[model samples]
Structures are given as C-alpha cells and as structure tokens.
Target chain A: MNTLELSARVLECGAMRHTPAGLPALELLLVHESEVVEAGRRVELTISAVALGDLALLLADTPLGTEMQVQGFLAPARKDSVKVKLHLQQARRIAGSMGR
Target chain B: MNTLELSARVLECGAMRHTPAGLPALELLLVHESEVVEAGRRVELTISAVALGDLALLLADTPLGTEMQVQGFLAPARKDSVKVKLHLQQARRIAGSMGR
Candidate 1:
C-alpha cells in the first residue's frame, strides 16, 4: 500500500493544496488547530483529518499548520490481496495567505 | 525594572502591537521564523527581537509565532532603586486578515 506525505511552513497556519499522480485517489481537508514551541527550536502542529478513511504523513518541509482537501476516489479490491498503488495529485496555493 | 508580556494563538502567525503603561519609551518589532510540533502536542517557535535594547518574554497564552510592536516610555530611577510597574497599552487588530 502506498502512503501519504505532508509538509508545512514554519510559524504559518492556513490552507494547502495537494495532487497525487496516477493512482487510486481521494480528497479531503486537514484542519490544524494550534502550535506551540520552546527555546529548543521545535514546533508541533495540532491537526485533525477530514477524510472518510485513514491517512499518514510521509514527507514534510518544516511543519506548518496544514489543512488538506480531498479531491479523488479509490476502489477497494481484495483485503491485502494485490499490491496497492497511489500517486497523490500535485497541489498549488490558490489563495488565503494574508492576515488581519 | 518592569517586565514585558507576550501572547499568541496556536496554528497562527502575525503581527502584534503593545503599549507599556508609563515606561521608558521604545519602539520595536518581533518577527517569528517558523514552528514545528509533534504527536505529543508539543511545539517550538523560533523568533527574534528587533529593538535597540534587550527584552524578555514574560508571559503568554499559547506559543503562537508572535510579532510584537512596542510602544511606551520607561525611565530608570536608580540602580536597583524603587519598584517597577507596567500597564501594557491595549490595541486592536488592524487589516490584512484575508486570504489570497
């Protein structure tokens, strides 16, 4: 089975876009609540998944508060019978990078 | 000497304004770099102060990447003489609370 990847900018919180390659696909949003850091230069993102199934974080840049939106579908075959393939669609930043 | 205070929201990063009540006047800005957190609900914020003198982080709510704008006046009476009092001036959120 293929895995998912996640990346984020430091000290940032907002929406994000993702696109997988040619593979079983799905779409959903990941909402981040808050983050806390210490003098040791480390951060943590409090996150929650909005998809119908389970997912995992494979890769990331820094760890910004990330929000995911699902946009595809997948067909479940036998239980662990065949090799699972996944190519997450590439995503882009549409808007909402400002503050008040 | 009087102490300073800092506060922030998790999963959020932006500018903050502060006005100390009747203290040695100084103006500065606090810029935050990035933040990272883990599954244990832990985070760290990397930050730097941009002022003519030195300062400290007295108190805060959550470790949100805080950008502080300082304003006020403080006069040192004598070396370790007298007491210190502070009343941070309150400010409101301006604009730029939009996503592009």
Candidate 2:
C-alpha cells in the first residue's frame, strides 16, 4: 500500500511505446517545487522525478510544460534496477490545456 | 505538492540525531511490497524506501521489523543529490507493537 500524489510540471516527455508485456507505456520527467513542514520548520524543496505510465495515450499528447496534479506509486525503474521511478495511475492538467 | 502514504515494514533503524537546523531526526529503511494496477494489469512491487525525521524520538525507539502505515512526502536525499528520500509527517503501526 503505497501512493504518491504530486503537483508537478512535465519537464520532458518521450514517445509512447509498448512494454515487454505489450501494454502501451510512456515516460516523462516531472518537476515538483514546494515548501514542506519538517518538524515545524519550513523547507523549500524541488524534486526531479522520473514518471512512467499507463496514461499512455493521454500523456502521449500532453504537451511539455503542462502543470498537472498526478497520483501514483514509486518502484524500481526496472526489476533489475534500484533507482526509483513513479508509475502514474492518474493525471489531470491543472492549467494550459483543453482538458486534464 | 507531494504526499506519500505507505504501509511498510521497518528494514533498519538508525540512532536518533539532530539535523543541522537543530530539529530531532531519525532514519530508517522501509520495505513495501504490494500489487499495483498498471494499465489495468496487476504488477507486484517491492520498494526500498528511505524514511527520515520528525517522529525522531518515537521512531528511534521503534523496534526493527515493525509494520506501520506512514504518511510523508518525497524529497531529495540531500541538497546535493537527486535520489529521493521520504520525510515522515505521520505514522501509525497497524500491528505487532505497543502502538504506532
């Protein structure tokens, strides 16, 4: 049971492709910048996150620089890698788009 | 905006310490295993997560191997790194301990 909800902007988006299991997949880089409360002190943070997806068709056409609210989970980039990547379950544009 | 809610087992716990800003802090490695929906298909995942802070004194004494539901946010491991770390905001043990 793990979930990640984030407000981010698409830093980069790659062409859509198929996973080895044949499902449509997309890759993107999202940037999150905000202030967080840690032990009651304000800390400014900017996260450079790697996001991958099932949004496939939806994100494929989503323009770069679009600000969005996304929800997902973190997992290894690949089974063989320890580096983490976000697997998006849902995403909605916050602005500058026809629809989320 | 970023938030993470996870059901994890403590893999390791380090001694409590104070951050440079003088707030109490603790560190732990949390393990999460679950199945997620990716494009409508179930994918099993195991995440190696690094958790830190706030609960400081409480988590320092929390035993190794306790399972708990934790809420937090993702941030860089440090100011000089891109790797993410989890900074807890709340935590509750589901079972097998005095109280989370």
Candidate 3:
C-alpha cells in the first residue's frame, strides 16, 4: 500500500481543464506548514505540494487559503521528468475550508 | 498533519555520508509498485522515492531488493527546487528484507 495524507492550505489554484479523454482535470499548488516529531525531535517546516486530476478540480473550487486534508499517492512529474509530484486521490475540508 | 505510508523495495543505495553538522546522512532510491484505487478506478504504477538522514542510515544497511514499509512526509526537492520528494522519517522491514 502507498498512501499520503496531508493537511494543508490552498496556496494557488490553476484553471480547470480536461484530459484528452474528456475527463476533468485540474492543477493546484498547496502549502503545508506544521511542526512534526521526526526522529524524536520536533521539526518545523513548510512544504509545497502539487495536485492534479479530479482532486485538483475538487480543490480548485475551494477558497484560496482554506485548509484541507488530502489523501493521495506519489508519482514522477512526468514520464521523462526526474521530479516527483503528489497525485491526489481524495480530499476533504479539515477546518477554515469548504467542501466535503 | 502530514504522513506517507508506503511499501516498497530498495532499488539503489547511495554511499553513506554525513551532514555538515557531523550527523550521519545517507541517500537512497526506492521503488514502489502497486495497484491503487483512484477516482473509483484501479490504477497500477511505480514510483521513485528518496530517503535521507536517519531513515537513510537505517535503510542503507538493508540488503538491496528487500521490501519495506516507510512512513514519512513530502517536501520540495530542495530549497529552490520545485520537485517534490519523500522525506523518510521512519521505516521498518516488512518482507524480503533485513533490518528493523
């Protein structure tokens, strides 16, 4: 099993679009800042997240700066891209956000 | 809260090294292959993951091709990089591998 669950805020939203197959697709940039316990040490950091597909669409409609929790998996930026990105599978409002 | 739980195999391991602070640091390339449910559709994929710091030290000693479960968070590739990476915080052997 491979899964990622994150609580973050919408930093930027991209225009809604569609895949070649006519499926809905969206893109988004999310920001997550929190304090986590790593190796028994409390660490504070901020992360930038990328979301695509239906989940992106779901997040697009959310008000900017709203905080939400996202559940997804990871993948490379593209077939030939060395970069990695988060492929959002599901999301829900946690607080200071709207939507299911 | 941000967390990623994944089961994967060690693909390639970088040489052991240390941070400027004298703390042990290691790098690793991991591969995860699995079928996931997305948008109500089953999707199969393979992903590349990067592990650093203590988790990397913990994984470096693991034999190659061993399957393990990694729990961590995602972060940008670097300070100015847009790419994302898996920041391994914890790991454990699941099967076909050695090390706790």
The Cα local distance difference test for each model comes to: 0.26, 0.71, 0.66
lDDT minimum window of 10 residues, candidate 3 chain B: B40-49
Per-candidate fnat, comma-separated: 0.00, 0.58, 0.54
What docking grade applies to model 3? acceptable
> How do all the candidates rank in terms of lDDT, highest first?
2, 3, 1
Ranking by TM-score: 2, 3, 1
Q: Runs in model 1 with CA error above 4 Å?
A: A1-59, A68-70, A75-87, B1-100
Q: Which candidate leads in lDDT? A: 2
Clashes of 3: 0
Write model 3 residue lDDT over A1-100, tens digit each, in one string: 7788888777766677766676676766677777765444332334434445556566666778877888787655557565555678877877544346
- Clashing residue pairs in all predictions, respectively, total 51, 0, 0
lDDT tens digits, residue span B19-80, model 2: 77766777777878777766653433444343345477667777888889988877766675
What would the TM-scores of all predictions be? 0.16, 0.83, 0.77
Isolated chain A TM-score, each model: 0.23, 0.78, 0.74
List-wise, what DockQ does each model earn? 0.01, 0.52, 0.45
**Candidate 2 local lDDT, A1-100, one digit each (tens):** 7788988888788877777767777878887878877656333444433334447777886788888998887776556554567788888889564543
lDDT of 1 by residue, A1-100 (tens): 1112333222432233332432222323232122222111122222122121122233233145433422211111224222111122333332376763
